[PDB]
Amino acid sequence: GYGIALHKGSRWKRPIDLALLQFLGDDEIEMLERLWLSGICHND
């Protein structure tokens, strides 16, 4: 999967993980992909 690169000593890794794991939870990330990657003419 994708991800965010850091400084190897940034110590911002922890504040991002909990924040990111929330958006994967209920309705945040599962809504953005509809706004951007929602094309048509799929398989049949």
């Binding site: 999967g1 909990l18 794991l21």
Partner: protein, 42 residues
């Protein structure tokens, strides 16, 4: 009484502070499983 958990353990925000996880083996999701279900003169 333990040091590792080699079992299906979902990654969750709530339980990401007491213990730390690793990179997943495989990616998955949540689905729903349900059951499924005189040919003449009717």
């Amino acid at each position: 009484q333990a040091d590792m958990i080699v079992a299906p353990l979902t990654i969750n925000n709530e339980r990401a502070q007491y213990i730390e996880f690793s990179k997943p083996f495989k990616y998955q999701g949540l689905t729903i499983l349900v059951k499924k279900e005189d040919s003449f003169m009717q």
